[PDB]
Structure 1
């Protein structure tokens, strides 16, 4: 049971990582429009990645 659920968790983590790497572009595109509101572009894109 332990290693089966470990394999399942690893598969889920891989799929989620793939989704995040695919949608990084959308994150950047959304974060483009808040670059002049007292926050850095890198901070904005990191918050977008978290979201």
Structure 2
């Protein structure tokens, strides 16, 4: 059981590593799309964070 779920946790940590990688890649895309909603009442970092 410990071999099983340890392999499981390895796989999950690797997936989280990949997703961290890609999202850090595309933060720029988010700033690009978030520029345009600039002054509709919500601060800028609120927009980039919810993006």
TM-score, structure 2 as length reference: 0.90
Greater RCO (Cα-Cα under 8 Å, separation 6 or more):
1
In structure 2, list runs of 5 or more residues that go unmatched. Answer: none
TM-score where L is the length of structure 1: 0.90
Structure 1 residue ranges, 4+ long, deviating more than 6 angstroms after superposition = none
1:1-51 correspondence runs (5 A): 1-47=4-50, 51=51
Deviation string, structure 1 residues 16-41 (Cα, Å, up to 9, x no partner): 00000000000000000001100000
**CA RMSD of superposed structures (Å):** 0.8
> Structure 1 unaligned runs (5+)?
none
Whichever of the two has the greater Rg, that structure is 2
The number of aligned residues is 48
